[PDB]
Design a protein around this nucleic acid. Structure first.
Lengths: 77, 176, 139, 173, 260
RNA sequence: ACCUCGGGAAAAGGAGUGGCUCUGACGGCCCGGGUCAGAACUGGAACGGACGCGGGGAUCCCGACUGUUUACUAGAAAC
RNA sequence: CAUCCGGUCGAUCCUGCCGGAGCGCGACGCUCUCCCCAAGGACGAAGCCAUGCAUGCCCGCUCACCCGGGACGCGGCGGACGGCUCAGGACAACGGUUGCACCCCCCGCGGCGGUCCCUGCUAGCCGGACACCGCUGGCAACCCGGCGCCAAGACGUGCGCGCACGGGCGCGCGCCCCGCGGGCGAGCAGCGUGACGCAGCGACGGCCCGCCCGGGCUUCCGGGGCAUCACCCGGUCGGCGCGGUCGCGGCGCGCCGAGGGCCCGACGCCUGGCGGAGAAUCAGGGUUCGACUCCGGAGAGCGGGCCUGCGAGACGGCCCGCACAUCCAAGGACGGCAGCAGGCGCGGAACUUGCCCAAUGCGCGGCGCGCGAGGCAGCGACGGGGAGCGCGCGAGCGAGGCGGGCCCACAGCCCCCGCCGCGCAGCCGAGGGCAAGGUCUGUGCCAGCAGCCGCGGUAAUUCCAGCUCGGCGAGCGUCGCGCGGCGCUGCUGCAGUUGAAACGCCCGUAGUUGGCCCCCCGCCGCCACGAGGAAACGGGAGCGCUCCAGGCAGGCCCGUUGGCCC
RNA sequence: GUCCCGCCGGCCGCCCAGGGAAACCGGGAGGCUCCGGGCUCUGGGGGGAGUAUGGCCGCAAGGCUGAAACUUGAAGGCAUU
RNA sequence: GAAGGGCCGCGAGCCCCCGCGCCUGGAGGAAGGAGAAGUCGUAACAAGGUAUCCGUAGGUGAACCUGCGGAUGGAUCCUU
């Protein structure tokens, strides 16, 4: 997207009947500042902001780069 | 909406799992003659009360001794049972609470207490006397045979001075 | 089978949801195809005007002519054949009388020797059929 | 019945969203104000600049402008501000179709009479380019006020790289 | 929907108000004023329930219409007037005056005061804001607004209101060591000295305070109201927020019911 | 719908179209193209204003088809 | 708060369903001695409604034939709360958790208070003018015309302190960063200065300013069934520039790109879909329901559209179409019970055209008025709870009946007393499962019964009746369904050689699952303990409603209590 | 000497335990009502019916997916006589 | 400033073709389940008088028969 990223955040949802969990993923749109440059897979610290668009209510506050290929890897940090 | 709608209500009795069982029927009839019980529903209400208590103690006992919970509630359950006379006041242990039987709860029913006090000849006579408002639980007239006396109130129970005996002398049969 | 893993809850939830449908009991209770099929249409009783009367030969081995009234329910105009309980109680029923018909007792299954009949008459012309047999009320 | 709720709009996936409510007077939006200019004073003098007033939620009134004429315009690097009549609207980012009608919108580049700003030209060497515009009776200014939300059209005389950019677009016409 | 709600249902009403479930299908709807519904209690409730001076709401209105009671020294005729912490409920005709504080169980309590104590009431500044030409204003918990505060006073610093001239008297600033009384939540009704304040930048400064029982209660700055420096300052309830536990209160209940 | 998946199909069924006044697109290195969009505004409720220029659908029978045929009474299902 | 038992056979062991055994919560039948509590037109008709009724209060401003009654109007405040129902709506409502540095708000409470001019000010206090009203009228009804006098805390105007000041505008910190404050985690406020503007109150000095209470949106996590729904969307997804709004935002519009969503199930479709708090059943785990009491949502026949106000897209407001009514003198008029009673239709199913604000609240008043909110009675085996139909061998009771208290808006009921006093059982069964004749009649595979096994064709343990007996009990039986039984849905905890069931095989991505190893740190789960925010409910402390279902009580009392957990 | 003895990977027979309703498995069908290594597939009384209809695939034949209404008190396994 | 008009928004209603869900009329076909007693044979279960049965293809009043490749659940755990 144009100066925007769709941050994917992973998380676990627990079901009590079967004490096993379900890995659940959500997609959230975020504004990417030109000051930052992100490649897919990078970890971005989105910070909540004014509803900026139909789907953008979050804005990248910091980026830490990741390698080209290190596997998709479920990460719920 | 109305205030009445807010009011709570409860089924205080437990009906049997099998209602035509031979052992249960035999014991019920033996209990029915013993305590002058009107219907099996009164016996059922007794079983319910014992099951509540047995479960409450059971849960507190599964909790470790000296766990705040047994101290706050276990002491309260024992107190209540000793004060209704269902539990011997010397036992005073939560483990003993589990080993109670419905007969013992039925023993504290005023109709049984009147019979051990002898203020009436039979359990049948005790039910009729309490119905006629003759019995007093201590400064209070009691019409309900079900009344479960507290251990302290047992001494206070006496035939009320206003009644069949020691009174006007003219009610019912005497008047005509 | 029994896939078990700390993060496998979704697979188990899906299996239970899909497999639970297999029992005839879950399907008859929840698929709801039966509700549309049920002449009673999800009611304990239904009011219908007797349109026909007949004798249905009892299923062998038992042999008798069971007495029944064919009734079209007022609610859905849906045909029902209803057994008349008690002895000689079809005499109480008259054609076009109007009856309240309740389930025979097997939740939509024919009961006893009567063949393919799932309903029974409980009331005739505002008067209970048992009461008519017991002579509590008359005509 | 013009409304700004997202009940009548689709989701992120593009799924239709079922409507669970009727229109709300808290979600209503009023019709847009076309703030024309009294440009042709010859036959527009018969209508003096008119600013309407509309009651809003809360009872607070937003003055909305229908026809406007002049607003405060300021040369910031000179600190010269005067009330200037707006001669003409040129170059709007939203649409150049608006420019033809002269309807004023915040951010439209306008032309204002330099006769109020005449004293600054005599004051020595104020800037450079803006002085030439004062010498010729037309100065470019951006309307910095939202006509129809306050009913005013104040602004700033364009200067710096912004002035050059706007002039470059308007060079052929 | 539409506008405001002018009715309160009895079971919706706050638990601390201790209204009867079968007593009514409606509860007094508390009005706006110096205290909000969660942190107030209606004037009718103090007079009808605890004071029992008026048998019915109608009697409470008659008494109020005649200006029998004065809160903060002003005769108020509002049956639903909100009453909260440090409000001075003085009924002169009955000859008895008390403050409204917080009990350990969290219900509001009437604590008797001497004439000097009756004169002043404590306040907590929520924050200092600039308005009306830039003059600073301080907003107390009782919503009392004071223009031009002395510069040292900061947010969450208890101050004392004269209530006769209605001005600031003194400031006991919020700091480590100063004695405070919790106003809300699980520890509501407890007086303890401040062991530490955790900054928790971002949201919810959480403070830890400990009473003389060696038990530390952890409560955020919202419901912490300073009551004097190391000194408890204004008179405090007889329990003194010492945190009686459930087992101990069980013995106290039994002694009270021992009396017949 | 149907289909030999190529077709059916321009299916059916609609909406626009003029004049004027503009505004964007598109090359080469201030010089060329006149096509494609988007507006206003105007006209007895008008615009492919002459001219040019399929009516459409549902079936049934024969012959798959494009072809060819009794110059001069059969152009077909015939060859 | 852990259970089974009949039926496949000549017999037997299995698997397997079938049927019983328990509890609900609605109907239906039969029956009912009293007292207490208590549901009641939700159940594919959010169908239609006759009548009466549910919203007033005020006394600001009295020249209405009592008086200083306080008609009527005008003003003011409320009518947006409340009640009612569940049609709509499935990344929604809703629940917990954030945010508004993106906001709107009446009352109240506590503050604050200044308002340019030129003219035009009368400031010891200013104009006019409208009903009500008087007359003159037109109306089938609805409904209003005209004329003339007269008032406001109504209206119109304006006295006014050029640090007079509503809005909006232009400008006014940095030097890699972060370390005082008016105020923050955050450059946010405020103001200084110029240009505009001259808005509000100023005719019984309020504008403004907080806090509150409510609202609007906003973060996060949860929020149906179907794969005979696999691709879906095209303001769809972003960026920019505006408009609009209370504001933020594709919200709308231009402009520019090509996104956005999806086996971790998109999109479609269907739902006899309000959601939670909760409820039914219940060893543990679970399953099903959540119309209905509290909270939030949504709608008043259906679509829309508005006005008023601080807040309504309001329907006991308006306007329009659309069906569906009423009146009519035929021109017109006019509604809206998913408010309360009551009526019709419909369905298996559901209460009085009562009485009243006394409480409990609310609106308005300072010396109480309004309220079908609510309370009070009637109806009512939805149900829950308590006592009866004797005991004794002679004494009694209460069911009644009548007075008087007590109670009640007024009754009544309860309860207390005197005086009389008259106890009164059903409904399903007896071959089993399943407790209770292998009785005595009729009848003859008929008539019937029987959930299931079966029974009846002359010696019916089974039908139809007397007879006894048994269960349960003022209740009992039947039907539909939920749950339990059913380890027959299985996470605990099923089965797949042959009972039903290992893909014919190999590769294979998503998915799921991964040996051993570093102690001592950072994130993730993870466990413990907090905090924060609703009670009711469910537990659970205490309290003898005479017991009990109950309720928060009570008694010279922890500041009597009403703890605490969830 | 293609001897003896192992080891590893197979292909087998017989079985002690154990298991199962048994027939029988026993290199598992054991280590499992004292039930949990991981992962996929399928089953949930007998018919109706692998039918109807919808999808896809095939030149067809057909394959793959796949019901319901309704009916019924049995169907089945393994052993004994 | 009243009606009235123009123009756009917001937007009922109405018609018009078009999809969708659902309900059902129907000559004629064509299944299935029961009626009870029919009719024609006798395919299978005993090597059921041609061992059955699986796929697939052809035939046939009807069960069924036949080709080809399987299986044993067979009537064979048994032969340089």
């Amino acid at each position: 997207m144009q100066r925007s990223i769709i941050v994917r955040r992973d998380y676990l949802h627990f079901v009590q009947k079967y004490k096993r969990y379900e890995r659940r993923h959500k997609h959230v749109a975020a504004h990417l500042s030109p000051c930052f440059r992100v490649k897919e897979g990078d970890i971005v610290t989105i910070g909540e902001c004014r509803p900026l668009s139909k789907t953008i209510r979050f804005n990248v506050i910091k980026v830490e780069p990741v390698s080209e290929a290190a596997k998709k890897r479920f990460s719920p940090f | 909406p109305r205030i009445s709608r807010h009011r709570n209500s409860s089924k205080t009795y437990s009906t049997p799992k099998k209602p035509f069982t031979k052992p249960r029927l035999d014991a019920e009839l033996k209990l029915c003659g013993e305590y002058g019980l009107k219907c099996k529903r009164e016996i059922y209400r007794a079983r319910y009360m014992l099951a509540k208590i047995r479960r409450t103690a059971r849960n507190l006992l599964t909790l470790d001794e000296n766990d705040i919970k047994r101290r706050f509630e276990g002491a309260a359950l024992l107190r209540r049972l000793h004060m209704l006379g269902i539990l011997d006041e010397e036992k005073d242990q939560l483990d003993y609470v589990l080993g109670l039987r419905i007969e013992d709860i039925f023993k504290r029913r005023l109709q049984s207490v009147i019979v051990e006090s002898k203020l009436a000849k039979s359990v049948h006579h005790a039910r009729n006397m309490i119905k006629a408002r003759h019995i007093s639980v201590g400064g209070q007239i009691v019409n309900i045979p079900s009344y479960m006396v507290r251990i302290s109130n047992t001494s206070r129970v006496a035939i009320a001075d206003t009644s069949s005996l020691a009174p006007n002398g003219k009610p019912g049969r005497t008047k005509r | 089978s029994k896939t078990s893993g700390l993060y496998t809850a979704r697979k188990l939830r899906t299996v239970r949801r899909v497999n639970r449908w297999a029992d005839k009991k879950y399907r008859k209770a929840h698929l709801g195809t039966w509700l549309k099929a049920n002449p009673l249409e999800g009611a304990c009783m239904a009011r219908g005007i007797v349109t026909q009367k007949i004798g249905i030969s009892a299923k062998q081995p038992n042999s008798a002519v069971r007495k029944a009234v064919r009734v079209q329910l007022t609610k859905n105009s849906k045909k029902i054949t209803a057994f008349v309980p008690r002895d000689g109680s079809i005499t109480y029923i008259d054609n076009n009388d109007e009856v309240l018909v309740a389930g025979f007792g097997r939740a939509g299954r024919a009961v006893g020797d009567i063949p393919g009949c799932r309903f029974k008459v409980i009331k005739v012309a505002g008067i209970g059929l048992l009461a008519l047999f017991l002579r509590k009320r008359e005509k | 019945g013009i409304t700004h709720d997202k009940m009548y709009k689709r989701s992120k996936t593009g799924a239709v969203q079922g409507k669970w409510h009727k229109k709300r007077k808290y979600n209503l939006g009023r019709q847009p104000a076309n703030t024309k200019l009294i440009v042709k004073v010859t036959s527009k003098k018969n209508e003096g600049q008119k600013i309407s007033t509309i009651r809003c939620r809360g009872g607070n009134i937003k003055r909305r402008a229908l026809r406007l004429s002049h607003g405060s315009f300021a040369w910031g690097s000179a600190d010269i501000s005067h009330k200037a009549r707006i001669l003409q609207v040129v170059y709007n980012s939203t649409s150049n179709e608006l420019v033809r009608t002269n309807t004023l919108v915040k951010g439209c580049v306008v032309q204002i009479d330099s006769a109020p700003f005449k004293s600054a030209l005599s004051n020595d060497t104020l800037d450079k380019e803006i002085l030439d515009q004062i010498r010729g009776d037309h100065i470019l200014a951006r309307i910095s006020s939202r006509p129809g939300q306050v009913g005013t059209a104040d602004g700033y005389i364009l200067e710096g790289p912004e002035l050059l950019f706007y002039q470059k677009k308007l060079a052929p016409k | 929907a539409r506008g405001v709600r002018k009715h309160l249902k009895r079971l919706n009403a706050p638990k601390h108000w201790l209204l009867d479930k079968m007593g009514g299908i409606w509860a007094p709807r508390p009005t706006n004023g110096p205290h909000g519904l969660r942190e107030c209690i209606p004037l009718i409730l103090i007079l009808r329930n605890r004071l029992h001076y008026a048998n019915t709401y109608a009697e409470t209105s008659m008494i109020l219409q005649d200006k029998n009671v004065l809160i903060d020294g002003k005769p108020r005729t509002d049956p639903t007037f909100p009453v909260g912490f440090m409000d001075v409920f003085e009924i002169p005709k009955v000859h008895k005056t008390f403050r409204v504080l917080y009990d350990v169980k969290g219900r509001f309590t009437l604590v008797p005061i001497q004439s000097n104590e009756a004169g002043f009431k404590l306040c907590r500044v929520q924050k200092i804001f600039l308005g009306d030409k830039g003059m600073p204003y301080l907003s107390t918990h009782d919503a009392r607004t004071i223009r031009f505060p002395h510069p040292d006073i900061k947010t969450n610093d208890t101050i004392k209101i004269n209530l006769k001239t209605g001005k600031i008297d003194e400031w006991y600033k919020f700091d480590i060591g100063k004695i405070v009384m919790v106003t809300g939540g699980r520890n509501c009704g407890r007086i303890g000295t401040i062991q530490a304040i955790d900054k928790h930048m971002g949201s919810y400064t959480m403070i830890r305070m400990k009473d003389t029982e060696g038990t530390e209660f952890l409560t955020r700055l919202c419901n912490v109201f300073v009551i004097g420096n190391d000194s408890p300052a204004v008179a405090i309830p007889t329990t003194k927020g010492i945190r009686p536990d459930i087992i101990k209160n069980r013995e106290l209940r039994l002694r009270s019911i021992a009396k017949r």
